[PDB]
Amino acid sequence: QLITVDEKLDITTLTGVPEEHIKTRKVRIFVPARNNMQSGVNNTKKWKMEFDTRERWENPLMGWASTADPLSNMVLTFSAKEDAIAFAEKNGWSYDVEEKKVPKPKSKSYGANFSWNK
Amino acid sequence: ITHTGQVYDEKDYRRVRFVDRQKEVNENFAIDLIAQQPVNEVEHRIIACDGGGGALGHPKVYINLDKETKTGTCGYCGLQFKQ
Amino acid sequence: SNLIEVFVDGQSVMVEPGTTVLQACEKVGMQIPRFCYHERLSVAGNCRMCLVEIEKAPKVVAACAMPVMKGWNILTNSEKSKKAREGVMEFLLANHPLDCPICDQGGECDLQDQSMMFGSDRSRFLEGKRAVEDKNIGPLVKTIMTRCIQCTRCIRFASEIAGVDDLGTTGRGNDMQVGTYIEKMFMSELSGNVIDICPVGALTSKPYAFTARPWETRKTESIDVMDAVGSNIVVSTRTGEVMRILPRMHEDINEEWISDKTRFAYDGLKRQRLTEPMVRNEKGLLTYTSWEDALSRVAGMLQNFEGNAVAAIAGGLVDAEALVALKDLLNKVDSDNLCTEEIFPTEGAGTDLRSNYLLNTTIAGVEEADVVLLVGTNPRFEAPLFNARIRKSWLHNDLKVALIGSPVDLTYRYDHLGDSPKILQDIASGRHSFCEVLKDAKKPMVVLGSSALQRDDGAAILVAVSNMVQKIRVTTGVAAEWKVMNILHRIASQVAALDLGYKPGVEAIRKNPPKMLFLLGADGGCITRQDLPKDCFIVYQGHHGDVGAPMADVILPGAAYTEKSATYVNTEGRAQQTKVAVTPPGLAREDWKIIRALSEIAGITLPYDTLDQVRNRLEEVSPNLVRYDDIEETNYFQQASELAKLVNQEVLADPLVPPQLTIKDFYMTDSISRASQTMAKCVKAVT
Amino acid sequence: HQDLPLGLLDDIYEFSKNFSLRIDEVEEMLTNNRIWRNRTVDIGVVTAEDALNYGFSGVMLRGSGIQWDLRKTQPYDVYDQVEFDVPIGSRGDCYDRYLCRVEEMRQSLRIIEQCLNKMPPGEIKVDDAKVSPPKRAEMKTSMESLIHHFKLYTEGYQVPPGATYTAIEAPKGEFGVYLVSDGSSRPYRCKIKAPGFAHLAGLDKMSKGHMLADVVAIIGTQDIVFGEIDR
Amino acid sequence: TSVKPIFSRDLNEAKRRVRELYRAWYREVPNTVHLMQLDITVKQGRDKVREMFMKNAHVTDPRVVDLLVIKGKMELQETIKVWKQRTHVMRFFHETETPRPKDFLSKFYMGHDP
Amino acid sequence: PTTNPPTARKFIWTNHKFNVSATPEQYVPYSTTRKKIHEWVPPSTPY
Amino acid sequence: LGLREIRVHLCQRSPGSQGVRDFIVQRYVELKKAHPNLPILIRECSEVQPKLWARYAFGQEKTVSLNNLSADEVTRAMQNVLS
Amino acid sequence: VRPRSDVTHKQLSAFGEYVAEILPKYVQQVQVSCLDELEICIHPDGVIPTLTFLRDHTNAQFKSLADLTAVDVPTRQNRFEIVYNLLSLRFNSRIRVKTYADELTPIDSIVSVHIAANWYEREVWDMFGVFFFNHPDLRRILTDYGFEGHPFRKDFPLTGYVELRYDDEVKRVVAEPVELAQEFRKFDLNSPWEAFPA
Numbered sequence A: 001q002l003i004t005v006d007e008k009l010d011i012t013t014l015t016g017v018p019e020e021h022i023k024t025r026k027v028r029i030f031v032p033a034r035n036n037m038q039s040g041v042n043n044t045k046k047w048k049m050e051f052d053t054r055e056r057w058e059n060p061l062m063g064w065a066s067t068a069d070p071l072s073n074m075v076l077t078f079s080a081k082e083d084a085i086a087f088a089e090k091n092g093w094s095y096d097v098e099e100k101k102v103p104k105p106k107s108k109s110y111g112a113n114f115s116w117n118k
Numbered sequence B: 001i002t003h004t005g006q007v008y009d010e011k012d013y014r015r016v017r018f019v020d021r022q023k024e025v026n027e028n029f030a031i032d033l034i035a036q037q038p039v040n041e042v043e044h045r046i047i048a049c050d051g052g053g054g055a056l057g058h059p060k061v062y063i064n065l066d067k068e069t070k071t072g073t074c075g076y077c078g079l080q081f082k083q
Numbered sequence C: 001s002n003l004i005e006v007f008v009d010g011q012s013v014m015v016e017p018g019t020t021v022l023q024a025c026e027k028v029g030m031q032i033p034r035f036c037y038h039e040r041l042s043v044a045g046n047c048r049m050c051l052v053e054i055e056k057a058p059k060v061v062a063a064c065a066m067p068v069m070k071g072w073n074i075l076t077n078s079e080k081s082k083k084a085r086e087g088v089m090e091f092l093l094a095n096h097p098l099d100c101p102i103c104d105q106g107g108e109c110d111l112q113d114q115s116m117m118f119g120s121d122r123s124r125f126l127e128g129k130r131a132v133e134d135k136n137i138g139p140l141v142k143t144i145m146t147r148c149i150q151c152t153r154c155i156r157f158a159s160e161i162a163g164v165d166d167l168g169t170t171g172r173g174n175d176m177q178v179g180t181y182i183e184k185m186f187m188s189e190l191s192g193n194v195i196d197i198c199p200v201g202a203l204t205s206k207p208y209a210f211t212a213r214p215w216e217t218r219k220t221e222s223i224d225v226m227d228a229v230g231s232n233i234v235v236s237t238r239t240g241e242v243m244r245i246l247p248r249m250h251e252d253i254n255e256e257w258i259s260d261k262t263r264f265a266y267d268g269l270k271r272q273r274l275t276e277p278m279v280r281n282e283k284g285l286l287t288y289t290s291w292e293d294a295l296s297r298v299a300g301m302l303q304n305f306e307g308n309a310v311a312a313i314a315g316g317l318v319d320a321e322a323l324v325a326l327k328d329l330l331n332k333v334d335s336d337n338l339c340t341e342e343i344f345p346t347e348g349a350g351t352d353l354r355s356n357y358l359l360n361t362t363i364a365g366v367e368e369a370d371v372v373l374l375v376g377t378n379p380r381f382e383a384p385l386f387n388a389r390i391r392k393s394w395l396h397n398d399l400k401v402a403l404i405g406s407p408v409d410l411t412y413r414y415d416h417l418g419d420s421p422k423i424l425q426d427i428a429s430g431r432h433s434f435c436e437v438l439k440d441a442k443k444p445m446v447v448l449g450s451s452a453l454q455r456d457d458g459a460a461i462l463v464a465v466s467n468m469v470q471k472i473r474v475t476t477g478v479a480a481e482w483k484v485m486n487i488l489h490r491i492a493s494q495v496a497a498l499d500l501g502y503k504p505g506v507e508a509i510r511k512n513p514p515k516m517l518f519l520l521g522a523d524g525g526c527i528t529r530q531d532l533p534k535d536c537f538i539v540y541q542g543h544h545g546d547v548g549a550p551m552a553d554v555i556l557p558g559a560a561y562t563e564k565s566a567t568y569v570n571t572e573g574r575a576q577q578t579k580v581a582v583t584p585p586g587l588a589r590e591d592w593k594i595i596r597a598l599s600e601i602a603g604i605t606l607p608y609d610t611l612d613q614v615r616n617r618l619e620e621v622s623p624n625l626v627r628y629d630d631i632e633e634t635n636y637f638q639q640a641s642e643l644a645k646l647v648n649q650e651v652l653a654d655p656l657v658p659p660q661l662t663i664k665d666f667y668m669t670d671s672i673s674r675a676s677q678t679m680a681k682c683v684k685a686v687t
Numbered sequence D: 001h002q003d004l005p006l007g008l009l010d011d012i013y014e015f016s017k018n019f020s021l022r023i024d025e026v027e028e029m030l031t032n033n034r035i036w037r038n039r040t041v042d043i044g045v046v047t048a049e050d051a052l053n054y055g056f057s058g059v060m061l062r063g064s065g066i067q068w069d070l071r072k073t074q075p076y077d078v079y080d081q082v083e084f085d086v087p088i089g090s091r092g093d094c095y096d097r098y099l100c101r102v103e104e105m106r107q108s109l110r111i112i113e114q115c116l117n118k119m120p121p122g123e124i125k126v127d128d129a130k131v132s133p134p135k136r137a138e139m140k141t142s143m144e145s146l147i148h149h150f151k152l153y154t155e156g157y158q159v160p161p162g163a164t165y166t167a168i169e170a171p172k173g174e175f176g177v178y179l180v181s182d183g184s185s186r187p188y189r190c191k192i193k194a195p196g197f198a199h200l201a202g203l204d205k206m207s208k209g210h211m212l213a214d215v216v217a218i219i220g221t222q223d224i225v226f227g228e229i230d231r
Numbered sequence E: 001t002s003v004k005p006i007f008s009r010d011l012n013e014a015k016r017r018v019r020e021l022y023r024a025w026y027r028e029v030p031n032t033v034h035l036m037q038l039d040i041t042v043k044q045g046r047d048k049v050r051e052m053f054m055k056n057a058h059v060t061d062p063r064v065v066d067l068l069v070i071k072g073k074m075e076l077q078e079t080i081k082v083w084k085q086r087t088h089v090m091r092f093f094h095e096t097e098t099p100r101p102k103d104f105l106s107k108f109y110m111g112h113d114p
Numbered sequence F: 001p002t003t004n005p006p007t008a009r010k011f012i013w014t015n016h017k018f019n020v021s022a023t024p025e026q027y028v029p030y031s032t033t034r035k036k037i038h039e040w041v042p043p044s045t046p047y
Numbered sequence G: 001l002g003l004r005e006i007r008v009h010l011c012q013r014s015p016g017s018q019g020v021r022d023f024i025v026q027r028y029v030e031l032k033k034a035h036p037n038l039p040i041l042i043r044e045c046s047e048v049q050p051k052l053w054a055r056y057a058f059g060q061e062k063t064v065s066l067n068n069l070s071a072d073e074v075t076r077a078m079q080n081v082l083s
Numbered sequence H: 001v002r003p004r005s006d007v008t009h010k011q012l013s014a015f016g017e018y019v020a021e022i023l024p025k026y027v028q029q030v031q032v033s034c035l036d037e038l039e040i041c042i043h044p045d046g047v048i049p050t051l052t053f054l055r056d057h058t059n060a061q062f063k064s065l066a067d068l069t070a071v072d073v074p075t076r077q078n079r080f081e082i083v084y085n086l087l088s089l090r091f092n093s094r095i096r097v098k099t100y101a102d103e104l105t106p107i108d109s110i111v112s113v114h115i116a117a118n119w120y121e122r123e124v125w126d127m128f129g130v131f132f133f134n135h136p137d138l139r140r141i142l143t144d145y146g147f148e149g150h151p152f153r154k155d156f157p158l159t160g161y162v163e164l165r166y167d168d169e170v171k172r173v174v175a176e177p178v179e180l181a182q183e184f185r186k187f188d189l190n191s192p193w194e195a196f197p198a
């Protein structure tokens, strides 16, 4: 038989994350925009949640960038806004969702460019 | 000093690295070595620089030497050609 | 009604009559490979790379230019429509110079990918290629135009989005070169967009010539702080220094475009930048020292000085979070002399109702306007992506633009009513001709620039405009949600400052000189040390050493909008969040914390210790700050007028003139801009 | 990646020609020595059904008499056009497994012979520039090839979304990759089945009633390399 | 809601298991400090056990608790059946790492991002 | 090399060196990129 | 009690705020005319009941809830604040 | 273009129906890839029953377990997708039975059905955190003895949070929070253009 729990699945205790990176890390759920350089829209389809950016100090010996934040390069991809919000809640990371913004329909017709008076 | 004017300041400590050691640099600097090669006086408006050696060179590109004032320079070799 | 049903591969999508074949595929979700078709640019049909095959039809049709018709099935992936792409891509590539490892639009090429996805694997062009002489179109755009696929999107943008109408096609055949016939530089704001809009890497950015390659660039989405339109932008950072800022689309604010200033002044962000907290030494020179010592220099003076002896002249690019941390601090020593450098008239209701100081007809409401009364501002150089708005709505719709300022280049046909603030009274009386024009307008909008307000009779100019808006509203009988009066700003931290109750103008500091002054990012000359009391103890809180630094007893370096999760708000009150693209440099710290820390070293210790808390703070003083991307609908214009009617002031005959008369005026304004080597190169090119 | 140099097949013939004597030589030195047989015979016997149940799948499967070679059963590549005999052992002691491994070396010389005798003239990589990178001369003279070289090296093949478990008879046993693929150029999951994760599990059962010394033989007869097990 | 029970039907039954594990660890701390020649005090170690057992005191859900002890039991097994040598155990004490202050002023003085 | 001498290209070395690792001639790695964030130097003239 | 600022965080189109907004429409102008320096801030919250925040001297802020209060009660509460 | 025989896509398809019919209480979906591979999908409760039928049925003997793995689709409510690939030396065919398990909803163990799974199930617990009831001895296999966190989860940082160095002061190896000297450069590689309808 099933048991009842109203407790938001929080599994922060099982994930195995250091305390500092669960209480000081804000992740943003956003649908990636399109670099204006290209006109393809296949990278503006799935929602992604990305952890907040952290220190990137220069390395003294070779000048390479060095980072102390483990969750930096991690960007998880989630198909829908609801599912991504769920991941933040059970993992205990703070979230600030940004609504998808899709190009509004635009009316175009080759005839217009040859308008008597535009 | 180096190709890009990389010279540790008089106070920087990476200079400790060079203490008792040679800071590796090359006397032969490209910015200068290309200059020596003379401008090729081709007689066609557009010429191609395959890079020298064909497959053993750089991607083939055609240069427009039409501008009378300036000389075409292969984005790859740096070789210059004038009409 | 008005809903044809067309099938895209038998999906029965339904589209308004008028939708093109390419558009029909988009709603199903398919994407026609396309070049020369941009959503906000006119259809041209030059490339013919979009040929698709409507069912039961002899020839393939041009997607981007074919009005869809009832019943048609698109057959986008039909064997035919693939030969119609496998054979076009054969041609674009045939005359193309293969210098893809030179073309810095390497991974940002809509022609390799559309070739790797929709084209063939080889080549049959055993013949020779062509070469086109390059052009020095400007100091920002590098036109290696041997790359050009003659797609004419530049010639469109340069005519349709921006009103330059300079770039054009020259010649016919395979040596049609799309470059200026005579070598005249493409000098205009909105110029850099050509880079972003040319899918080929023929003309690309000259500063960001070869510093990076796109796969590496980590892309953080943030907000434009150089201008008050608050254009959305994406800061591309590699290994921790910003490499490029390119637009990201916001339908309402910047729809895929950004100004020349806010994409080539990322270089200014990297020099003359403050990093360590220096203090004035006995000798009289600023000496770098640890925070602890620099902060207690300031804290000790703060404890000694009482209210109205401590003042803050904030201004420029400071965020809302610092602005509330500076007010909460100076009130905990009871001086409410917090002020901003840009004077907004505050004798009637100012700062109290939130419509006296906002462009409340939305940036997207310029599209549905009828007559715009530009009064005393050059939008072209004060809000370039709002000038574009009136550009599009004068072209695609029919806005009748009228300017009461200097006759100035506006990229559109305006009516120059005159250069006199009192003729505003002329229209209010109904004496001037355009009085009827407005009478004829069902949805009119006045726009009073902040720079007109910055003159001495600015209080009178606002009152005079409010009177005219009042009877314009009465005569037109315009509906309540249509809002005629709006005023646009040119300083990013002005709407936020006025929102948090900061009182505009340094007039209050002028009448009583503070023993102490926190210049929170102020590089303006609003008060100078000669003007200050003998002590002249002032501490600069900012990012670049420009005017406030060398006259500063303490330097507390801060960050810039590329380097903090702060909030800003543009002119119609849409609050927006900058995200940290790069960690702040040196010992430099986030603006809000420096002030929280100074407070803890002083004993009045601001209650907020984590950003989320500083925000919750913003919520108690003001609503917009916490709700992002959300314009505030209602306003109270009627009570604003009543107080305007009480105010009596004289508009002096001196013509109202925008400070940015021509584009050299525009390139260098704020600190980051001034510190720009690219902006400096642009300035000398004009001069 | 690249065509065989013009002298390799002659040199592979000379090695294969004389290699069998070399197997014959350790054959004499370590196959009848009473000391080897005693150390190897009747040690780590694994019964046929137990071998299938423990997922042994290798010489360990064949040594106890189960007849399974992914090279003949499910012929990958050309293993359908080469003739060889799987060396099935009978009883399962570590000797029968050794003898099988020595036979597979001999049977592989039979397969290597056929490959040198019948290798076709042709190209070494599929001609789809979308999947295999364009030739050095072509990328330096044709634009379609530079674009295909640039995209393939910088971004990738972008394999179509799907998932597959492909097993080949690696010398240790069945080596399989379960590659789950989104449409992206980089994989989503790649479970390397290691012939060896299963074999090492069998050590406790196989090394039953055995001395400290027998365990050294038991690991040796599983041919376990910890790279595959640890992955 | 409507979840299936892993091993404990309710926080009550689950807590029973936690008690057992605590006891287990409590009885084990001394042995480890001797079989690993660790340079710690049994009392000290036993407090650490308490620390951990409470670090996760907030969990209210029965299922999460049950896994927590499964995992906890596994750790004990690695320390009583000794497969975890000193380096592994002492890591719990975070002996070498320099502690970071949590005071705002402290962080301000040291790190860009707190 | 005697029979078919190699190609000389007026940059190639004439004295080739062995492992210089223990000897002072050894490579010591260094970043060759110049400074990135130039700083505002304080005015040396007392205000 | 030195009064420095009063913030009326009304919430537009909210049932309770009706009284607050009515006050703004009918009496705001008057209050300002009377106190022509004090900054009375009309701001617009959301999904929050209206709050008449008041900032007294030396950084003390005080709160009076205006949820579901009549137009004159809002007027009376405002008048009580600037004593 | 690879050669494809539809003989298999038909044989395997039919078998799929056969399995489904015989085990309808658990089989949710049964598909054959375009690559001629069957992939019965079963409710997690059908782990024991569906495997056993395949291990011991005359018309479907699937004696050895090729592999047990768990893809992790973070979006999917049930995060893990335990996949069991089986081989039938009798019928020379492989099938894959895949179930779904969330982080704290354990799956049954099949060590009974195939003892091969004794190790792989420990591997799935160590890397992904799924738990297997009735497992003889479930304990970390691949990770370090004191490792905290399940590594192959998509939400775990590649570099991880701890790294080891020898400290003289304490004369013993000691974890420290990871500090990397050149962070993993995260090249963005997806192209903004799709390839086909799929």
Ligand code: SF4
Binding pocket: C096, C097, C098, C099, C100, C101, C103, C104, C105, C106, C109, C110, C111, C112, C147, C199, C200, C201, C202, D147
């Ligand atoms: S544009 Fe630049 S990148 Fe795109 S193909 Fe032509 S050269 Fe290669």
Ligand code: SF4
Binding pocket: C147, C148, C149, C150, C151, C152, C153, C154, C155, C178, C197, C198, C199, C200, C202, C203
């Ligand atoms: S320049 Fe860029 S945009 Fe203008 S035509 Fe050539 S390609 Fe099309």
Ligand code: FES
Binding pocket: C033, C034, C035, C036, C037, C044, C045, C046, C047, C048, C049, C050, C051, C062, C063, C064, C065
């Ligand atoms: S997009 Fe169809 S014509 Fe260029």
Ligand SMILES: [Zn+2]
Binding pocket: B049, B050, B051, B074, B075, B076, B077, B078, B079
């Ligand atoms: Zn060249």
